[PDB]
């Protein structure tokens with residue numbers, strides 16, 4: 366009576382200054398004429414979807430909804446806001462106040478109005494709203510996804526659905542750069558045939574409608590020629606390419622030099638500098654060029670606190686107005702500490718862009734990455750102004766991690782990874798949220814066992830409980846209470862997974878059915894591992910029997926393509942098998 370609903374992102378400023386109130390079958394619409402075009406179509410769609418009519422003219426008594434910019438200049442808006450303004454905020458900023466009856470939305474620019482609507486959309490529940498005073502704006506100005514992974518590229522529907530999802534969580538950047546789109550890279554010189562072109566146009570259109578900058582990436586580095594007529598012919602292919610995507614409405618571009626053998630720092634930068642001049646600037650309404658250098662992680666870029674040969678020359682040749690992306694201290698790493706970003710930003714003498722390789726799983730596909738942004742410094746905004754994550758080829762399940770990235774990048778300072786993660790699953794899964802948390806909590810840590818690792822540890826509280834069990838048994842202390850609690854945990858893993866199998870929407874189930882079965886198998890080996898232990902009671906029969914099962918469950922898990930809970934549910938079984946409790 367009446368609480369604020371989960372919001373994503375977390376708005377900069379929000380306080381309850383009322384009990385909230387129901388919105389009528391019919392509201393008062395004021396401002397649609399002036400307000401941002403896209404912010405309004407998003408309103409009408411929400412309004413439609415929710416059995417909420419727009420008054421052909423006033424009252425009664427209707428709930429009063431008022432919307433527009435600050436340029437735009439309306440009377441009801443100001444009285445409505447009644448103290449609050451979006452006049453002194455960054456681009457994409459807005460204000461929202463729901464005053465008993467009244468609902469006021471003004472953004473600084475069209476962008477912020479649209480976002481103000483998104484926050485409205487999330488605030489209303491049943492027609493009920495809370496009374497609140499909101500001023501909101503992003504920490505980082507560019508926030509989004511780079512579809513840059515290896516593997517089957519997102520389908521065309523996948524992409525439209527992501528692009529909508531991005532609008533609703535205030536992410537504003539989508540970089541188009543699938544490694545295995547032949548035309549992005551393997552055949553970069555070549556024009557998209559007619560029907561990809563048709564499909565490409567809808568991406569673009571859909572993106573503008575959701576205030577998403579659609580960025581067109583190209584990766585010519587495997588075979589591009591730099592010198593003489595060969596270089597002219599090739600640089601022209603780049604133009605031809607960008608032009609066609611310009612002539613479709615694209616006003617951002619990226620040119621990527623990652624994962625190639627040719628380390629011609631000077632030549633790469635010169636291609637970029639040429640494009641900045643001949644395309645970007647000659648066009649006037651194209652956003653800054655974005656690039657990744659062939660050295661794109663601190664280990665590859667730096668030695669002894671100083672740039673390496675390639676990075677040094679790249680840094681000094683490439684135009685200041687160009688956004689350079691780096692991945693952090695490693696290609697797939699635990700963290701980006703402030704000190705890493707300071708270092709990299711120093712070398713390029715600019716605010717940097719991040720290409721963050723999580724939740725992407727192309728380098729270890731058996732595992733789904735279902736955790737929150739983790740390990741990224743909460744003061745990164747000091748040196749970084751462009752933050753994107755590289756997602757899984759699994760579009761739907763990627764949403765959980767992307768959800769958290771939206772809150773990290775929009776409200777960096779207050780970002781809490783555990784709360785963000787919970788919110789994300791709550792917001793995305795509804796009645797299934799609790800069961801989905803159980804499962805996903807075991808699938809957050811990525812680790813290919815060699816060079817690639819990132820993410821929150823899997824099921825950390827269970828892992829500490831397993832640790833305590835071993836400490837009490839090696840000490841020869843009574844552990845029956847804990848043993849009993851772990852039975853409940855393992856039983857609850859299997860219960861949740863079964864509920865997920867039978868009730869998940871198909872769009873999500875098809876991405877995780879194998880991993881669901883993997884956690885069920887381990888939960889059963891976990892349970893059999895406990896029996897193995899209780900069998901303490903010098904019962905050799907029950908011991909051999911629970912042992913062959915624990916061992917079979919483990920072996921099934923080890924053999925299976927799906928990977929989950931390596932250091933927790935799976936490891937517990939190997940820990941239990943090696944705990945020799947038969948000694949006298």
Ligand SMILES: CCC(=O)N[C@H]1c2[nH]c(CCc3ccccc3)c[n+]2[C@H](CO)[C@@H](O)[C@@H]1O
Pocket residue numbers: 513514515544623624657661691692696697720722725727728755
């Ligand atoms: C910043 C550029 C980047 O990360 N490029 C690719 C990239 N390069 C690398 C390291 C190089 C590599 C490539 C293939 C096989 C092993 C290692 C890892 N990754 C990501 C994670 O797999 C891929 O998704 C990216 O497309």
Ligand SMILES: [Cl-]
Pocket residue numbers: 589590591592
């Ligand atoms: Cl050459």
Ligand SMILES: [Cl-]
Pocket residue numbers: 731883921922923924925926927928929
């Ligand atoms: Cl496996």
Ligand code: NA
Pocket residue numbers: 714715716
């Ligand atoms: Na800068």
